[PDB]
Each structure stands twice: as structure tokens, then as C-alpha cells.
Amino acid sequence: SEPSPYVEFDRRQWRALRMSTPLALTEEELVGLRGLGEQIDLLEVEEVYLPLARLIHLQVAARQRLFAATAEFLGEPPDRPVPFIIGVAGSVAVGKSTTARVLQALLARWDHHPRVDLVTTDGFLYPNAELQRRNLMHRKGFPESYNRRALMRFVTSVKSGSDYACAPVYSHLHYDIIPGAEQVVRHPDILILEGLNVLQTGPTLMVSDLFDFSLYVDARIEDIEQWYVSRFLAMRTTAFADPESHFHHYAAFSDSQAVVAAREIWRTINRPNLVENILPTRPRATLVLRKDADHSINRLRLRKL
């Protein structure tokens, strides 16, 4: 009685689209792809990520057909397909990075055996020096803190079938970009771009306009704040514990101080960014994975149109 471009699913419903897709991941390999605080088990990989993987390959061939028509039209000469670009977006601490890692492993282990790369956009973040100069240290993560010009070049270069294309490297440990570090990407079959900012749209063409498929990992804003604070507290004995950690001073905080500090940074930087720039981007993602307070994925929204 009122059409929608979306189709909504239940884990029970989605679970059924797996068909007879092979589970090529061990419980040992899954654990190494897992992020701090993530609750993902093989059952979810089976129940949720397998159908998603199937759907994606179905479309990788169908999309390769499209560029064929434009090629047949322009009447140009291949054997090297157009890379299939996938964008993964989500809030900080919502688990998008884990989702991206699983998705890569799952896709790379497919009969025809593709070359699946994964690049995180934080490598296109301006160096801390440039941020201070632009007065954006307090806005790290916002669309302005990234070198969107460079990011666009990279993706354009890769999808154009460039032989070699490389990107800068970000160190979460040093909270800055690594001097002289490069991530090289040579003609991949599927490139996964993961970032807070990736689904952004605008006046000029943007990276989002070059995606062939996009995932938005969603959760309740109040639940993410919890995951964030939790992770923060747990990093006192892991990352912050390292002397080279930029936030080594946090390691000594007490459960009490830590929760305060964590909440401050959240409502001050991460929350505004989520509400203002990331969330407004959800409507356009191809697939939206809605997570529950327990980190469990129980609802899925697919773009049929």
C-alpha cells in the first residue's frame, strides 16, 4: 500500500538465503580477524555473512556485464575486469573494521579465487601536523580531516585498471600517519574501502559514486557509546599499555577517570560526527546490518531498487 526501495529481513529469513555456500573459515581464523570487544562467532558468519557473500558475488558478475556494454559501445579492445568496489561505513567502535575483515576473507575464498584487497580510509587522514595547522585536532574523523582529493584519486586510479596504485599508512598506535609507509594495490578483483566517511555525497563526484556495493553497520547510538566506553577501559591494559602509545597516559587512569574521559571524547567528537555526518548517510547504503546491544546482528535492510 506504499512501495519502498528497501526490503527488510529477520535473521531467520536472511539465514535461509545461504543456500549451499561453503563455510571456508575455521574458528581459529575467525578469532584472528576479530576486534577488541566484538562478539562474532562462526554461527553469525554462517547465518549472516554467508548469504551476504553469496549476494555480492552474484552482483560482481552482473556488474562486470554493465562495463562490458559501455566498452562494446566505445568499441574499445580484455582479461582484467573492472575492480568491484565495496564501501563499508559505520560509527567508531560499531565494528565496521571487523565486518570488513571477515568480508574480505569470506570473499577471497571463492572457487574462482579472487584477488580481494582492503584499504582503510584513515590512511587518508591529514597528518597531525597538517591537522594542527588547520585547527582540526578536535575534529579528527570529520569529513574535513581527510584528504578527499587524494582518496578520490586513489579509488579512481584503481577502478581505471591502474597497474599499481598505492595509499598512505595510518598508525593507530602513534595516532598519526607513518612516514614513508605505503599500501600498494595491484589490479584487485574486489577492493573494500572501510571508513567512517566513505558513504558521503556532495556537489562533485565522490568516492561513494564509485562504489558498486555498500554496507552500513548500524546500532543504537546509545549502545555504541557503551561499546566505545567499554573498549576504552579495556585498552588500558592493551594498546595504551605500550610506551609508544600516543595515549599511554590513559593506561594509568582508574575505572572511574577512564569512564569520564571516554564519555567526554564521545559526546564531544565521535557522537557529533556520527549524528551530523555518518548517520545521514545510512539511507543510501546497499545493505544495512543492524546490531543489537549484545553486538548481535538481528535485522538487515537491503536496497532492492
Ligand X SMILES: CC(C)(COP(=O)(O)OP(=O)(O)OC[C@H]1O[C@@H](n2cnc3c(N)ncnc32)[C@H](O)[C@@H]1OP(=O)(O)O)[C@@H](O)C(=O)NCCC(=O)NCCSSCCO
Q: Which does 236 bind (CB under 5 to 8 A by kind): ligand X, a second copy, none?
A: none
Q: How far is CA 1 from CA 4, 98, 163, 255, in A?
A: 10, 38, 50, 52
Instruction: Write down the least CB distance from residue 48 to ligand X, Å.
Output: 18
DSSP string, 78-107: --SPPPEEEEEEE-TTSSHHHHHHHHHHHH
Which amino acid is present at 65?
A: R
305 scored as a contact of a second copy (CB under 8 A): yes
55 scored as a contact of a second copy (CB under 8 A): yes
Question: What is the C-alpha end-to-end distance of the chain, expressed in Å?
Answer: 17
65 scored as a contact of a second copy (CB under 8 A): yes
Q: How far is CA 278 from CA 94, 161, 195, in A?
A: 12, 29, 10
Residue number with CB closer to ligand X (6 or 247): 247
Q: Which of 12, 73, 77, 180 binds a second copy (CB under 8 A)?
A: 73
Residue number with CB closer to a second copy (42 or 55): 55
Burial of 104: CB neighbours in 10 Å, binned 0-12, 13-18, 19+: buried
Please count the residues of this chain forming the interface with a second copy, following the rule CB under 8 A. Answer: 43
Q: Which stretches of the chain bind ligand X, using CB under 6 A?
A: 35-36, 92-93, 96-98, 122, 140-141, 172-173, 175, 196, 231-232, 239, 247, 265, 269-270
Alpha-carbon span 281 to 300, nearest angstrom = 16
What would the grid cell of residue 236 be? Answer: 588500558
List the one residue out of 297, 124, 135 whose CA is nearest residue 288. 297
In the block, cell 546482528 appears at 297
Interacting span for a second copy (CB under 8 A) from 2-10, 90-98, 185-193, 256-264? 2-10
Q: Write out the binding residues for ATP.
A: 90-97
Q: Which does 98 bind (CB under 5 to 8 A by kind): a second copy, ligand X, none?
A: ligand X
Q: Which of 160, 254, 257, 268 binds a second copy (CB under 8 A)?
A: 160
Q: Which does 205 bind (CB under 5 to 8 A by kind): a second copy, ligand X, none?
A: a second copy
Rounded to 5°, the CA angle 185-189-195 comes to 60
Q: Which does 68 bind (CB under 5 to 8 A by kind): a second copy, ligand X, none?
A: a second copy
Q: Which residues make Cβ contacts (< 8 Å) with residue 72, sequence separation at least 6?
A: none
Residue number with CB closer to a second copy (64 or 298): 64
Contact positions toward a second copy, by CB under 8 A?
A: 2-5, 7, 17, 51, 54-55, 58-59, 61-63, 65-66, 68-70, 72-75, 82, 153, 156-157, 159-160, 162, 201-205, 209-210, 280, 283-284, 302, 304-305
